């Protein structure tokens, strides 16, 4: 079908006035269309035309240069003729990789599958889901309620109550004080809270 | 609550309704940067975000916003579990 | 025979006329044949063979000469060469590279159009040369090749009856080495319908007409049969072209027939070597079965039309039922139906032929590629090196070892296990009985197994029968048929001529049993002798009728089964179980040879290759724990390195230690060092300890075992186990992975035993979850939660952008680090692509016996350890010595293994010396006892050969003639029983109990590595279910029968909890866990992921599955 | 082995009683159908959209 | 027989239009995920391939109608589209099955539930469970009929959540994580709570 598309595009350019045959001109366009399609959608991961081009160059050179020495060329030999450095060659080789299917059966039987033993790195762990809540019930609830307005700056500074962290002046103007006053009260709060007498309870989460 | 399970023959309108987007392009994931494409089989706009309450363009990344559809890339900030709950449809020629 | 064999008195009454041959000849000789070593040709020539050819030389001679389409130029191969192995065995194994040596084949090129010729060597890859111990080393792992049992090529006459019409029909199935098979037939309607292939059926008369023979020729030779009389007039065809064209259309319908291609195609599939081939064995079998080419060594290896008409003639004679027939020109031969499981046509292909098949396939593909590449190149500057591309042969050889089901990890659980793995025979694998089918009929014993394949040793799983070990005396004929030795006998006299016989050639004669009596000269004492007979049956015959005899009583049993004392007193089932379990015995810290055993224990060690032996007579110069040195008698110095605390494939310790001292004059073939399970060069798989047979408070109920705490105090049954952990640092797209001491989010005390380069110190003790190698990897996730921001701002841990993905000890393993190895790309180590560094850490640990461990004897009496009791709770003899083990009485008779009682009694007799007085001559019960057995000292060792052991009368006399202890008294009476005092209450037991010394093993099915359990942890991604298996937190499976049991109980709620909350309810698991932690009420389960996924699948199939309420 | 999903998990405080103000727009389509999209407080008013 | 077939549609509400498709649904991606394994390997289910074979053949057809190609070209394209959709829904019931690299037929949607594997026959008959353990069994003659002996380590690790709850309840740990870490190394003062 792609060859048919190439034939169509060839016929919209074949020119009798030059005296050439239709086959001679149309072969080039047929090859163009077929190769463009075969390089554009022959992989599950689309390596673009310019990248699959260099991939084919590397493949052909690796296949051909073996006869010169009787070995499969390594990055040194490949780079010596690809006009590119070894690290880029390694990147190209990695880029040419293709994905395998999960449905392959492993274990000398048609019972298990390649995919049963995939451990999830994103799966929620219940304990952490609990722990954070406890922290939310220990940090925000107790330790915050010890300095009134002096602790109020922490609510806005770190955005614990909304999630939006605030700059100094931005929370100095909600009250009637300058940004440096906010910095000063924040320093007072940091010095008082950082002391071990209160940090002993809060430290054990990641001590 | 479960009382009985009906199995009908789905029509075209039901298939259209089941899908929040149409797959108009055959790529799965970008070979570089390893992210879904704008109209591929894994697009975030159709099946939802891959990161919990995040956005493709990064303009929205917090539970502060949920249910909001981004105005520049179309991904709505919501839990990543929707990627196993939403379907897509292909309109045949 | 063996210079260093410890003196072990034997109860043997018969004499050995043939010493046990090498126990690894089957592997080494086959490999030597494959490589064509001159040291194999020297032996092959002695067999009266002229110009013998090696297997690889045969593969090359197959493609010699080569030609193209028009025969303008010819190629040739010859003379394979081997220079030397790349590196040593130890270096090859420690550098996890592949053992191999280069292979060079001299190629030649001839130009027919010009007469120009040339030749040169061609590098044809690296061939994995075998080691001395009959194993290969690939990628740092030791592997073995197990033979494959298959059906030999030939003619298979067969018969079957019809259920409906009670008519019998015959067939002749022919299976070739390669190509398409064919089979004759005699239908119930007398139509002799051949099925030439998977294509359809037609009368054989057409098959015969299509090639040469006309209508009037068939009457010349078959004018004495009824079926062909009818067939020659039922059919109607006189034109050879029609018959040829008819068979052409039926073979390949829809193709254009031609009058010449009709003969061309039929000749291209039966009578040409390039498509259809019968190996050297196939022609031999067909010729002798039908009497063709009598005695001719002709090299033909493909069908001959004479043999086809001979086959139909044989079928005709068999259908009539005549006893014998004769082909005009051949020799007279008998007529009978052939057994298909009989070892006269079942043959084993060994390592040599298994490798040769892959070499042949690779060479064929290479020949295809070269015949393609030939066309483009010129005819003056071309050379074989330019033509040839060695890729396929090397790739196929490398694919064979790493992927073939017949290349197996060697069972290095103990020397005996490895010895009996190299000699294993397998019916499964490619080219054999498909595992899916696994016919139940072929598994049973056939009367030809005697002396060739052990009937007792088989796996107890579904592979029963299909796999068995080779016999002790068996050797493989060059054709692949197992021979066995027999003593030639004559007119009432046994001769000294021992001849190896095959099954078929043995079937012609009469073979007598070994135990039968003979005089000093060799005459048979008894008039009537019990012998075997052609039907594979046991009969009695007079002296004149006998024609052969077995070589020794042990001939029919394998090496492992031979090491079970008093085997003949044990049923086949328990003997099989004991033989299987003897291969599961883990070596102990200190080995002890059995007090009572067979005469085999010696050889089974020496031939196992795990004992260092002297290569030359001389004197030991200096001895050290790490290596030994010896000075030969011809001014030569040899040095042997001893392995120390090396890991085996299965995790055990492959330790070695010396047994000689400086200034000791050793002899050739004398053990110098012991293997894991060895003492003084004798196999030591377990410990001999005091046992009393009696029930005891139910702690040993239902075959459980009870142990004295002594066995734990003095480490009698302690074992060393070494695990091997790995981790590789490799690059990523966000950054490289680094190995360092420092890792985020840990205390400095966690890194106590970590080097500056991250790896733990040698000798440091590692607990569960400890750090073995610190390895940080890029993370790059900067937007932390505001609470974490606040906490990290409060304290000094400001921020980091990397993970703590260090290597940690598995949850359940512990020990001391005994070694570390590091491979780095910095020095161009052969790290597989995509890896920068790799580190291996060895963690070794001692294991004392404990509750739940498994111990078994040599007679299939395995049991778990129900209780370990203090030394003061054990029953003790009057002298005060407590018993170590006590076994339940009720298990002995019903399980039906009385050999253990005799083992215990003879063990007691051996432990305490015995002496029999001679006043009124020798006692009657000791009439035949050898002189050396009259008196022995204490702590002696005795040998009881299998099928020639101590009869119960002699053992009863020995029990009655025991020596006293230090106090001048006997604790065990003449009946093998002794009084015992209860360790708890102190009162003597009301009745005497039987006591002695039993040799018990420690099985690798330990409790230390089988206990596992899970509360909550990792899951599976796709299925959202907890994962299982070897990994930590391996969850359990709630199958279908469990659901049925719960349903039968009416447990609706518990079933729902086990199916939703605890398996795949993602939103329910967290809520249940937090409710438990808070102590709140468990929420009701939600919709499981399984149902949701099923609904989504059915929706994807355009089915509108809508839930109703 | 460990598998990845090109994603991540977070557990911060969800809620509904406190929310950012949506700005709801509706789009008519060339096939005759209409759809709705809620946008953020930025008060943006996109003129064109690609619908389900 | 034809009545027994047709009467199903009669008065059943479902019109026969269902068996002619104007749009083919796409199963959610997570059931056909694109997983990055160790070392950069990617793995993806065969469905992703089959779906592409549709989206390609459809797309090109959308082009061929635009160009007004001859009847033969468009007829062939529509035949390939029908064959590709048939392979997508249930492979192998017509012609030879579509195969991937090597020699193996791809698994279609119908193969997800019809064969030996799949939901109905394989995945719905049992599943793995948490809060469970396994070990060898030995004879306890000192046990009452309603008693069984459990190893200390197995019982502790299996009751871990209850152990932490009680430990934090009795002020042995200041928070859940502290109790968890204490139990990880089996501190001596937890057995009195486990019992
Ligand atoms: Zn966005």
UniProtKB/Swiss-Prot annotation, chain B:
On the tree of life, the source organism's domain of life is Bacteria
Which residues of the whole protein are included? 6 to 98 of 1317
State its role.
Answer: DNA-dependent RNA polymerase catalyzes the transcription of DNA into RNA using the four ribonucleoside triphosphates as substrates.
Residue ranges the record marks as coiled coil: none
Describe the family membership recorded for this protein in Swiss-Prot or TrEMBL: Belongs to the RNA polymerase beta' chain family.
Q: What is this protein called?
A: DNA-directed RNA polymerase subunit beta'
User: Where Zn(2+) 1 is bound, by residue?
Assistant: 55, 57, 70, 73
Subunit structure of this entry? The RNAP catalytic core consists of 2 alpha, 1 beta, 1 beta' and 1 omega subunit. When a sigma factor is associated with the core the holoenzyme is formed, which can initiate transcription.
Curated annotation (Swiss-Prot), chain C:
So which domain of life are we looking at?
A: Bacteria
The family database entries (PROSITE patterns) matched by this protein are listed as: RNA_POL_BETA
Query: Which reaction is the catalytic activity of this chain?
Result: RNA(n) + a ribonucleoside 5'-triphosphate = RNA(n+1) + diphosphate
Q: Which InterPro entries match?
A: DNA-dir_RNA_pol_bsu_ext_1_sf, DNA-dir_RNA_pol_bsu_external_1, DNA-dir_RNA_pol_su2, DNA-dir_RNAP_su2_dom, DNA-dir_RNAP_su2_hyb_sf, RNA_pol_bsu_bac, RNA_pol_bsu_CS, RNA_pol_bsu_protrusion
Query: What are the protein's UniProt keywords?
Result: Antibiotic resistance, DNA-directed RNA polymerase, Nucleotidyltransferase, Transcription, Transferase
Report a single Gene Ontology molecular function.
Answer: ribonucleoside binding
Question: Which processes are annotated in GO (biological process)?
Answer: DNA-templated transcription; response to antibiotic
Return the broad EC class. transferase
GO cellular component labels: DNA-directed RNA polymerase complex
Against Pfam families, the record matches this protein to:
RNA_pol_Rpb2_1, RNA_pol_Rpb2_2, RNA_pol_Rpb2_3, RNA_pol_Rpb2_45, RNA_pol_Rpb2_6, RNA_pol_Rpb2_7
Listed EC numbers: 2.7.7.6
Q: Does the keyword Cell wall biogenesis/degradation apply?
A: no
- Known partners and oligomeric status: The RNAP catalytic core consists of 2 alpha, 1 beta, 1 beta' and 1 omega subunit. When a sigma factor is associated with the core the holoenzyme is formed, which can initiate transcription. Interacts with RbpA, which partially restores Rif-inhibited transcription.
Q: Which family does it belong to?
A: Belongs to the RNA polymerase beta chain family.
Tell me more from the record. Mutations in the RRDR sequence (residues 423-449) confer rifampicin (Rif) resistance. Rif blocks transcription initiation but not elongation.
What name appears for this protein in its UniProt entry? DNA-directed RNA polymerase subunit beta
Q: Which organism is it from?
A: Mycolicibacterium smegmatis (strain ATCC 700084 / mc(2)155) (Mycobacterium smegmatis)
Q: Which gene encodes it?
A: rpoB
Swiss-Prot record, chain D:
Q: Which cysteines are joined by disulfide bonds?
A: none
| Keywords in alphabetical order | Antibiotic resistance, Transcription, Transcription regulation
Copy out the induction comment.
Constitutively expressed during growth, increases slightly in stationary phase (at protein level).
Asked whether the UniProt record includes Cytoplasm among its keywords, one would answer: no
Instruction: Spell out where the chain crosses the membrane.
Output: none
Task: Give the Gene Ontology MF terms in alphabetical order.
Answer: bacterial-type RNA polymerase core enzyme binding
Would you kindly state one Gene Ontology biological process term found in this protein's UniProt entry? positive regulation of DNA-templated transcription
Presence of keyword Transcription regulation: yes
Per the similarity annotation, which family is this?
Belongs to the RNA polymerase-binding protein RbpA family.
Q: How does it assemble?
A: Monomer. Forms a complex with the RNAP catalytic core, specifically with the beta subunit (RpoB); its binding site may overlap with that of Rif. May bind free principal sigma factors.
The function of this protein is: Binds to RNA polymerase (RNAP), probably stimulating transcriptions from principal, but not alternative sigma factor promoters. Partially restores transcription in the presence of rifampicin (Rif) in vitro; overexpression leads to an increase in the Rif tolerance in vivo, with smaller colonies. Seems to act by removing Rif from its binding site and preventing its further binding. No longer stimulates transcription in Rif-resistant RNA polymerase (with mutations in rpoB).
Q: What is this protein called?
A: RNA polymerase-binding protein RbpA
Q: Which organism is it from?
A: Mycolicibacterium smegmatis (strain ATCC 700084 / mc(2)155) (Mycobacterium smegmatis)
Q: What is the lineage of its organism?
A: Bacteria, Bacillati, Actinomycetota, Actinomycetes, Mycobacteriales
Swiss-Prot record, chain E:
Q: Tell me, how does this one assemble? A: The RNAP catalytic core consists of 2 alpha, 1 beta, 1 beta' and 1 omega subunit. When a sigma factor is associated with the core the holoenzyme is formed, which can initiate transcription.
Family per record:
Belongs to the RNA polymerase beta' chain family.
> What's this protein's function?
DNA-dependent RNA polymerase catalyzes the transcription of DNA into RNA using the four ribonucleoside triphosphates as substrates.
Q: What is this protein called?
A: DNA-directed RNA polymerase subunit beta'
Q: List the source organism.
A: Mycolicibacterium smegmatis (strain ATCC 700084 / mc(2)155)
């Amino acid at each position: 079908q792609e060859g048919n598309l190439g034939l169509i595009r060839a016929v919209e350019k074949f020119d009798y006035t030059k005296g050439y045959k239709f086959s001679t001109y149309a072969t080039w366009w047929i090859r163009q269309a077929i190769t463009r399609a075969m390089a554009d959608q022959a992989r599950t991961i689309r390596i673009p035309v310019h990248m699959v081009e260099v991939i084919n160059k590397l493949g052909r050179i690796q296949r051909e240069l073996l006869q010169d020495l009787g070995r499969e060329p390594t990055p040194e030999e490949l780079a010596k003729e690809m006009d590119i450095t070894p690290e880029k060659v390694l990147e190209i080789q990695q880029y040419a990789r293709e994905p395998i299917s999960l449905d392959q059966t492993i274990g000398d039987e048609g019972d298990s599958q390649l995919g049963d033993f995939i451990e999830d790195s994103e799966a929620v762990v219940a304990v952490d889901a609990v722990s954070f809540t406890l922290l939310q019930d220990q940090l925000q609830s107790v330790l915050e309620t010890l300095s009134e307005r002096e602790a109020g700056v922490v609510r806005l500074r770190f955005g614990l109550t909304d999630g939006q962290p605030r700059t100094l002046d931005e929370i100095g103007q909600v009250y009637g004080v300058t940004r440096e006053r906010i910095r000063q009260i924040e320093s007072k709060t940091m010095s008082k809270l950082r002391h071990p007498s209160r940090s002993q309870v809060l430290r054990d989460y990641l001590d | 609550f479960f009382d009985e399970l009906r199995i009908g023959l789905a029509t075209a309108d039901d298939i259209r309704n089941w899908s929040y987007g149409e797959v108009k392009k055959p790529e799965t994931i970008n070979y570089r940067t390893l992210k879904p494409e704008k109209d591929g089989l894994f697009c975030e706009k159709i099946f939802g975000p891959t990161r919990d309450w995040e956005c493709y363009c990064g303009k929205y990344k917090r539970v502060r916003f949920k249910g909001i559809i981004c105005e520049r890339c179309g991904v709505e900030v919501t839990r990543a579990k929707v990627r196993r709950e939403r379907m897509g449809h292909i309109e045949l020629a | 025979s063996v210079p260093g064999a410890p003196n072990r008195v034997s109860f043997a009454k018969l004499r050995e006329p043939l010493e046990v041959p090498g126990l690894l000849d089957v592997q080494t000789d086959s490999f030597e044949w494959l490589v064509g070593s001159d040291r194999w040709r020297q032996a092959a020539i002695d067999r009266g063979e002229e110009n013998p050819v090696g297997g690889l030389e045969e593969v090359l001679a197959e493609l010699s000469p080569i030609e193209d389409f028009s025969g303008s130029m010819s190629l040739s191969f010859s003379d394979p060469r081997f220079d030397e192995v790349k590196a040593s065995v130890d270096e090859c194994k420690d550098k996890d590279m592949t053992y191999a040596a280069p292979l060079f084949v001299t190629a030649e090129f001839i130009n027919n159009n010009t007469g120009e010729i040339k030749s040169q060597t061609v590098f044809m890859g690296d061939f994995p040369m075998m080691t001395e111990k009959g194993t290969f080393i690939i990628n740092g792992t030791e592997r073995v090749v197990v033979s494959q049992l298959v059906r030999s090529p030939g003619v298979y006459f067969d018969e079957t009856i019809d259920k409906s019409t009670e008519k019998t029909l015959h067939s002749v199935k022919v299976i070739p080495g390669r190509g398409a098979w064919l089979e004759f037939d005699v239908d119930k309607r007398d139509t002799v319908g051949v099925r030439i292939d998977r294509k359809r059926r037609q009368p054989v008369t057409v098959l015969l007409k299509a090639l040469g023979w006309t209508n009037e020729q068939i009457v010349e030779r078959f004018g004495f049969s009824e079926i062909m009389m009818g067939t020659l007039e039922k059919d109607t065809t006189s034109g050879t072209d029609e018959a040829l064209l008819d068979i052409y259309r039926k073979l390949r319908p829809g193709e254009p027939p031609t009058k010449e291609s009709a003969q061309t195609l039929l000749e291209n599939l039966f009578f040409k070597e390039k498509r259809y081939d019968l190996a050297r064995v196939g022609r031999y079998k067909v010729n002798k079965k039908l009497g063709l080419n009598a005695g001719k060594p002709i090299t033909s290896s493909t069908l001959t039309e004479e043999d086809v008409v001979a086959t139909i003639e044989y079928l005709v004679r068999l259908h009539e039922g005549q006893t014998s027939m004769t082909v005009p020109g051949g020799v007279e031969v008998p007529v009978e139906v052939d057994d298909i499981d009989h070892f006269g046509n079942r043959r084993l292909r060994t390592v040599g032929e298994l490798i040769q098949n892959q070499i042949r396939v690779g060479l064929s593909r290479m020949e295809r590629v070269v015949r393609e590449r030939m066309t483009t190149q010129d005819v003056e500057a071309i050379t074989p090196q330019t033509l040839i591309n060695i890729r396929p042969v090397v790739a196929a050889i490398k694919e064979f070892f790493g992927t073939s089901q017949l290349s197996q990890f060697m069972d290095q659980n103990n020397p005996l296990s490895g010895l009996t793995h190299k000699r294993r025979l397998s019916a499964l694998g490619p080219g054999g009985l498909s595992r899916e089918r696994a016919g139940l009929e072929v598994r049973d014993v056939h009367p030809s197994h005697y002396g060739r394949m052990c009937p007792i040793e088989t796996p107890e799983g579904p592979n029963i029968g299909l796999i068995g070990s080779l016999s002790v005396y068996a050797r493989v004929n060059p054709f692949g048929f197992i021979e066995t030795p027999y003593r030639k006998v004559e007119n009432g006299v046994v001769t000294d001529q021992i001849d190896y016989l095959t099954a078929d050639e043995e079937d012609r004669h009469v073979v007598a049993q070994a135990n039968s009596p003979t005089d000093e000269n060799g005459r048979f004492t008894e008039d009537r002798v019990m012998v075997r007979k052609k039907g594979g049956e046991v009969e009695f015959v007079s002296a004149d009728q006998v024609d052969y005899m077995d070589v020794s009583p042990r001939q029919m049993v394998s090496v492992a089964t031979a090491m079970i004392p008093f085997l003949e007193h044990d049923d086949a089932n328990r003997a099989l179980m004991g033989a299987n379990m003897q291969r599961q015995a883990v070596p102990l810290v200190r080995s002890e040879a059995p007090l009572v055993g067979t005469g085999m224990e010696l050889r089974a060690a020496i031939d196992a290759g795990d004992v260092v032996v002297a290569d030359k007579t001389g004197v030991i110069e200096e001895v050290s724990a790490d290596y030994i040195t010896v000075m030969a008698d011809d001014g030569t110095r040899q040095s042997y390195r001893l392995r120390k605390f090396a890991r085996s494939n299965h995790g055990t310790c492959a330790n070695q230690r010396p047994i000689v001292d400086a200034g000791q004059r050793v002899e050739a073939g004398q053990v110098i060092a012991d293997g894991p399970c060895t003492q003084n060069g004798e196999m030591a798989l377990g410990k001999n300890l005091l046992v009393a047979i009696m029930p005891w408070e139910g702690h040993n109920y239902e075959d459980a075992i009870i142990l004295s705490n002594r066995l734990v105090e003095e480490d009698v049954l302690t074992s060393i186990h070494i695990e091997e952990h790995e981790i590789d640092a490799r690059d990523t797209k966000l950054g490289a992975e680094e190995i360092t001491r420092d890792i985020p989010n840990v205390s400095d005390e966690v890194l106590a035993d970590l080097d500056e380069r991250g790896i733990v110190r040698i000798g440091a003790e590692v607990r569960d979850g400890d750090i073995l190698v610190g390895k940080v990897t890029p993370k790059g996730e900067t937007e932390l939660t505001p609470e974490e921001r606040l906490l990290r701002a409060i304290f000094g841990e400001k921020a980091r952008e990397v993970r703590d993905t260090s290597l940690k000890v598995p949850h359940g393993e512990s020990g001391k680090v005994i070694g570390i190895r590091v491979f780095s790309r910095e020095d161009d180590d052969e790290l597989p692509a995509g890896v920068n560094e790799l580190v291996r850490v060895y963690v070794a640990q001692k294991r004392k016996i404990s509750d739940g461990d498994k111990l078994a004897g040599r007679h299939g009496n395995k049991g778990v350890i129900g209780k370990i009791l203090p030394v003061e709770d054990m029953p003790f003899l009057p002298d005060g010595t407590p018993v170590d083990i006590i076994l339940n009485t009720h298990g002995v008779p019903r399980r039906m293994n009385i050999g253990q009682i005799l083992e215990t009694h003879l063990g007691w007799v051996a432990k305490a010396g015995w002496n029999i007085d001679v006043a009124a001559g020798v006692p009657d019960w000791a009439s035949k006892l050898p002189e050396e057995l009259y008196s022995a000292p204490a702590d002696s060792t005795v040998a009881t050969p299998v099928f020639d052991g101590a009869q119960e009368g002699e053992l009863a006399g020995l029990l009655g003639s025991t020596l006293p202890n230090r106090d001048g008294e006997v604790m065990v009476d003449a009946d093998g029983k002794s009084t015992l005092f209860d360790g708890r209450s102190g009162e003597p037991f009301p009745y005497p109990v039987t006591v002695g010394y039993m040799y018990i093993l420690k099985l690798h099915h330990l409790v230390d590595d089988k206990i596992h359990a899970r509360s909550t942890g990792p899951y599976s991604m796709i299925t959202q279910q907890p994962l299982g298996g070897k990994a930590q937190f391996g969850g359990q499976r709630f199958g279908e029968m469990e659901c049925w049991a719960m349903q039968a109980y009416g447990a609706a709620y518990t079933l729902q909890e086990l199916l939703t909350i605890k398996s795949d309810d993602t939103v329910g698991r967290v809520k249940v866990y937090e409710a438990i932690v808070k102590g709140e009420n468990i929420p009701e389960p939600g919709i499981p992921e399984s149902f949701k996924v099923l609904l989504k699948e059915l929706q994807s199939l355009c089915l509108n599955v809508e839930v109703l309420s | 082995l460990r598998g990845s999903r090109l994603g991540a998990v977070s557990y911060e405080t969800d809620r509904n009683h406190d929310l950012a103000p949506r700005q709801v727009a509706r789009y008519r389509t060339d096939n005759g159908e209409e759809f709705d999209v809620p946008f953020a407080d930025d008060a943006e008013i996109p003129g064109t959209w690609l619908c389900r | 027989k034809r009545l027994k077939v047709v009467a199903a549609f009669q008065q059943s509400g479902n019109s026969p239009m269902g068996m002619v498709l104007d749009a083919v649904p796409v199963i959610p991606p997570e059931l056909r995920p694109m997983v990055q394994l160790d070392g950069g390997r990617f793995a993806t289910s065969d469905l992703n391939d089959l779906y592409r074979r549709v989206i390609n053949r459809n797309n090109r057809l959308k082009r061929l109608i635009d160009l007004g190609a001859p009847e033969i070209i468009v007829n062939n394209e529509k035949r390939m589209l029908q064959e590709s959709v048939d392979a997508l829904f249930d492979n192998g019931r017509r012609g030879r099955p579509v195969t991937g690299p090597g020699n193996r037929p791809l698994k279609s949607l119908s193969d997800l539930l019809k064969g030996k594997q799949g939901r109905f026959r394989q995945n719905l008959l049992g599943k793995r469970v948490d809060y469970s353990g396994r070990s060898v069994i030995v004879v306890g003659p000192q046990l009452k009929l309603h008693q069984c002996g459990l190893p200390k380590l197995m019982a502790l690790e299996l009751f871990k959540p209850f152990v932490m709850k009680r430990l934090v309840d009795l002020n042995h740990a200041q928070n859940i994580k502290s109790a968890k870490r204490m139990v990880e190394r089996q501190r001596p003062q937890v057995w009195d709570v486990l019992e």
